[PDB]
Structure formats: C-alpha cells, structure tokens
Amino acid sequence: DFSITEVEATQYLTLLLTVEHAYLHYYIFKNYGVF
Amino acid sequence: STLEMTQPLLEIFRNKADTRQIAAVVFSTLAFIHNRFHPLVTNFTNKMEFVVTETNDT
Amino acid sequence: INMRRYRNAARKLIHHYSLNSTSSTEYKISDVVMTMIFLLRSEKYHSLFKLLETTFDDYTCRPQMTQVQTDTLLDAVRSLLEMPSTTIDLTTVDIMRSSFARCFNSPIMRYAKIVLLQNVALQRDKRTTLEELLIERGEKIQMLQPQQYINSGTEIPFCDDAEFLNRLLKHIDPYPLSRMYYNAANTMFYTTMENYAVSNCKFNIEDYNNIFKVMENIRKHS
Amino acid sequence: ELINMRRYRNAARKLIHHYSLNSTSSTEYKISDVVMTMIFLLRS
Numbered sequence: 001d002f003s004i005t006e007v008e009a010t011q012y013l014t015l016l017l018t019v020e021h022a023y024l025h026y027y028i029f030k031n032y033g034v035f
Numbered sequence: 036s037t038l039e040m041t042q043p044l045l046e047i048f049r050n051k052a053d054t055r056q057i058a059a060v061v062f063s064t065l066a067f068i069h070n071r072f073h074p075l076v077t078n079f080t081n082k083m084e085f086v087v088t089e090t091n092d093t
Numbered sequence: 094i095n096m097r098r099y100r101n102a103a104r105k106l107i108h109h110y111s112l113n114s115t116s117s118t119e120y121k122i123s124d125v126v127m128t129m130i131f132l133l134r135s136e137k138y139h140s141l142f143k144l145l146e147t148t149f150d151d152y153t154c155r156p157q158m159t160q161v162q163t164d165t166l167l168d169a170v171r172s173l174l175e176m177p178s179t180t181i182d183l184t185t186v187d188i189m190r191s192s193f194a195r196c197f198n199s200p201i202m203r204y205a206k207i208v209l210l211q212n213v214a215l216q217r218d219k220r221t222t223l224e225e226l227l228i229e230r231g232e233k234i235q236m237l238q239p240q241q242y243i244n245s246g247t248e249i250p251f252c253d254d255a256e257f258l259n260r261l262l263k264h265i266d267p268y269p270l271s272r273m274y275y276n277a278a279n280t281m282f283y284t285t286m287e288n289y290a291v292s293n294c295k296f297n298i299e300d301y302n303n304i305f306k307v308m309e310n311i312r313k314h315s
Numbered sequence: 316e317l318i319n320m321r322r323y324r325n326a327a328r329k330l331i332h333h334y335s336l337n338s339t340s341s342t343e344y345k346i347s348d349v350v351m352t353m354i355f356l357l358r359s
Binding site: 043 | 342
C-alpha cells in the first residue's frame with residue numbers, strides 16, 4: 001500500500017541501464033589498466 | 036527500502052542543495068550491480084570522495 | 094472558428110520538436126497550417142510567429158531582441174505549453190526552426206521520406222571529435238577536488254521479506270513493462286546526444302549500433 | 316507581523332490540487348507545508 005506511481009517507476013528503472021553500461025567500463029579498466 | 040529513500044527521486048536529484056544523498060545513491064547502485072553480476076563481492080568502504088559535474092564544458 | 098481545437102492539435106508538434114515525446118505519428122501538414130493560423134491570430138505570440146517565419150538561408154536574419162523581450166517570450170511559450178516545470182534553451186527552439194526550414198525547402202512527396210537525421214543546426218562551431226574532447230578534458234577535470242564523502246552505515250544493505258516485496262510485485266503486475274524500455278528509456282538516451290551538436294561533435298551511430306552485436310553474446314552462451 | 320502568505324498560498328493550492336483530485340500519495344509535500352496551509356486558511 002505504497003502508491004508507487006507507474007510512470008515514475010519508469011525513471012526508477014531507466015538509470016540502471018546507464019549505470020550498468022558504466023559498470024562494463026569499470027570492469028574492463030579494473031582488469032586491464034588505463035590503456 | 037533501507038535507504039533514507041527520499042521517494043521524489045527526480046526532485047531529490049534536482050535539489051542541488053546537497054550531494055551526500057546523490058553520492059550514496061550512486062555508490063549503492065554500483066554495489067547493487069556488482070552483487071548482481073557476482074553473488075559475493077564488496078568494495079573497500081573507508082571513503083571515496085567524489086565529484087559533481089555542472090556544465091557541458093565540464 | 095475552433096481556435097480551441099486548432100491549438101489542441103498544434104501543441105503536439107512543438108511539444109515533440111522541443112522535447113522528444115514518446116508519442117508518434119505526429120506528422121501532418123494540416124496540423125502545421127492550423128499552428129501557423131493560431132500563431133497569426135495570437136497577437137501576444139505574433140513576435141514568435143514572425144520569428145518562426147524567418148526560414149530562408151540567404152536571408153537568415155533572426156533579429157536582436159532585448160533579454161526582456163526574450164524572457165517574456167519564453168514565459169509565453171512555457172505557459173502555452175503548460176510546462177513551466179522546466180525551461181529549455183531558446184537555442185533548441187531555433188534549431189527546430191532550422192529543422193522546419195529543412196522541411197519547408199524539402200518538397201517531400203507521397204514517399205515517407207522521414208528525415209531521420211539528428212539536428213545539424215548550430216553556429217560558429219569547430220569540427221571536433223573524441224580526440225579534441227579528451228585533450229580538453231584533463232585540465233578541466235583535474236583543476237577541482239571532489240566535494241565530499243562520509244560513511245552512513247555504508248556496508249552491504251541486503252534484501253527483506255519476500256512477501257513484503259510481493260506486495261510491490263502485485264502493485265507492479267499489470268503494466269506494459271516490456272514496452273516501458275522504448276516508452277521512455279531508449280528514446281531518451283538516443284535523443285540525449287544532441288550534446289554532440291553542441292560544439293559539433295560528429296556523432297556516429299556506427300558505434301552506437303555496437304549494442305546490437307553486444308546483445309548476441311548472452312544467447313551465444315545460452 | 317511577517318508572513319509569506321503568497322508562497323504559502325502557492326504551495327497550498329498545489330497541494331489541494333493534487334491531493335483532492337489525483338487522490339494519490341503526497342510524497343512531494345510535508346507537514347510544514349500543511350501547517351502553512353492552515354496559516355493561510357486562518358488569515359484568509
């Protein structure tokens with residue numbers, strides 16, 4: 001009984017994909033250095 | 036749900052008056068993704084002082 | 094004369110052009126015409142109408158206007174849009190004006206020649222790419238210390254009652270989540286890259302496509 | 316005396332709009348704002 005808006009749940013979702021995309025680069029760097 | 040959620044997420048991010056919550060949200064999301072990808076992971080917690088970017092030139 | 098209906102239609106056009114509405118099939122010429130008629134018959138907006146008229150390359154002569162006038166105009170704009178909740182650079186609107194100049198000069202016929210291009214309009218830029226960008230970045234970044242951090246019980250928050258969560262599950266259940274991705278996320282991301290037009294970075298889909306070959310790999314590894 | 320009746324009214328109008336019409340959680344709004352609403356009511 002929390003009234004979570006369907007619409008704003010969209011934004012709640014959307015960031016995650018960007019963040020994951022970043023996570024990819026983070027992992028690559030952490031495993032293989034700057035270059 | 037454990038978070039000081041501050042539900043109006045967009046306007047919270049739109050506040051600018053504080054950055055602690057922004058940074059904590061970022062970090063926590065990072066941890067979330069990491070623990071997704073692997074079941075048993077963590078990051079050193081002491082401090083990671085971070086940045087806010089203000090303009091296209093930056 | 095149904096000024097009201099005319100406006101009701103018209104709005105959507107500018108609404109889309111200004112900001113990438115996840116609605117579709119906005120196009121029609123009649124709607125444009127009614128828009129122009131409304132603007133003509135809206136004295137207060139005649140300034141905007143006469144500016145938008147300016148649509149010819151050899152005569153591109155958008156007049157100087159005092160900041161006062163410009164602000165009043167932006168107020169008008171926002172009000173009529175019923176979206177004062179944010180304000181967008183006049184530059185965006187002028188870019189859309191240049192887009193409309195494209196449309197005008199294009200005698201596009203029965204064939205649905207969707208332009209599909211991201212807006213190219215901009216002035217006095219220099220051609221740039223990731224090279225120039227990187228070269229720029231370093232100093233602008235390193236010149237400033239990060240603001241702050243403090244601990245707040247940071248370490249590894251975790252899940253809670255599955256049934257507690259099932260509450261929210263059931264709340265969430267009906268929605269077109271499978272579509273939600275297009276319904277905002279992807280469209281907004283792809284449209285965000287007008288920043289490249291800002292300072293004329295030549296955006297290339299030719300890597301943006303990489304997502305596609307990327308996604309195969311999960312199916313490869315079953 | 317010193318009152319910002321104008322902003323009190325504005326926040327109160329916004330409140331009452333969403334509150335009595337959308338019939339959904341007032342997560343954006345706070346007790347302080349409700350209080351200022353009653354202030355405006357009492358003086359209006």
